[PDB]
């Protein structure tokens, strides 16, 4: 489906250090490619994917300066939130922001988003028109009025329809051989005689990209989801992902069951059995 570029900012206050820490990571689809961490004497934006590293000095300088500016804006945001909620200066709090753009079939913005959370609760979000805000709570209603007076949503709209889409297009080209290639899962079924009267069959999908996958078990074509254990999809460590789904079947009845693997990298969905 549609490709996207997104960033994820996490700011935490640190009353004991008298400061705040600001971390920002960027992703194209399911692939991280940049980071910034404010907790260094001379912090710089840094590459976290091999294909971004060819960017010139001017790319790195711009991103580093945005990050330094963000670290200050989020330091102030943490103090303003503490004030809105009349919270103690004793405690650490967390403010997160995520925003990004999805690319449409004509190479223009399909959908842009931009939103925040404080201590994990929704705070404020940019609307569909990209020119206005929806507040989740009362403090964010005061933020909303200040931001309408600022008018900065016009410049965020400009970014999401412009630079966000234009840079995503560039990253897709630079990393095309991984970012625009669906890597199919390598699969197998294992068997673990478990119980006096049960055998565990586990259906694995290893090394797949992107993250979206469907693993299901059937008994003679009938879905077994209510009885299967399905683990959360997890990174392989090389930029791909893994997942498994297991279920206990009666002894001697392995031939009655199939695992169905559906992933965009496959030529065809797989039907696997313990053979």
């Amino acid at each position: 489906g549609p490709h996207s570029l997104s960033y994820f900012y996490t700011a935490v206050s640190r009353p004991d250090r008298g400061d705040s820490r600001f971390i920002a990571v960027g992703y194209v689809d399911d692939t991280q490619f940049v980071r910034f961490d404010s907790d260094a004497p001379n912090p710089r934006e840094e590459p976290r994917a091999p294909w971004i590293q060819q960017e010139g000095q001017e790319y790195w300088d711009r991103e580093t300066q945005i990050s330094k500016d963000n670290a200050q804006t989020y330091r102030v945001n943490l103090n303003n939130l503490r004030g809105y909620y009349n919270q103690s200066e004793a405690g650490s709090h967390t403010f997160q922001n995520m925003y990004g753009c999805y690319l449409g079939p004509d190479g223009l913005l399909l959908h842009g988003y931009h939103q925040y959370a404080y201590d994990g609760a929704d705070y404020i979000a940019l609307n569909e028109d990209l020119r206005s805000w929806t507040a989740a709570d009362t403090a964010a209603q005061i933020t909303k009025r200040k931001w309408e007076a600022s008018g900065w949503a016009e410049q965020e709209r400009s970014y999401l329809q412009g630079l966000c889409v234009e840079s995503l297009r560039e990253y897709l080209e630079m990393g095309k051989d991984t970012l625009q290639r669906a890597e199919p899962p390598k699969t197998h079924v294992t068997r673990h005689p478990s119980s006096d009267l049960g055998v565990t069959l586990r259906c694995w999908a290893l090394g797949f990209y992107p993250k979206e996958i469907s693993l299901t078990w059937q008994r003679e074509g009938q879905d077994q989801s209510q009885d299967m254990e399905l683990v959360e999809t997890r990174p392989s460590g090389d930029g791909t992902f893994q997942k498994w789904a297991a279920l206990v079947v009666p002894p001697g009845e392995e031939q009655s069951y199939t695992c169905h693997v559906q992933h965009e990298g496959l030529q065809e969905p797989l039907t696997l059995r313990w053979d």
């Binding site: 963000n70 804006t73 303003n80 925003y99 600022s150």
Partner: peptide, 9 residues
């Protein structure tokens, strides 16, 4: 490439 954010909450 990142957006520019200067407007505190």
């Amino acid at each position: 490439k990142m957006n520019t954010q200067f407007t505190a909450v």
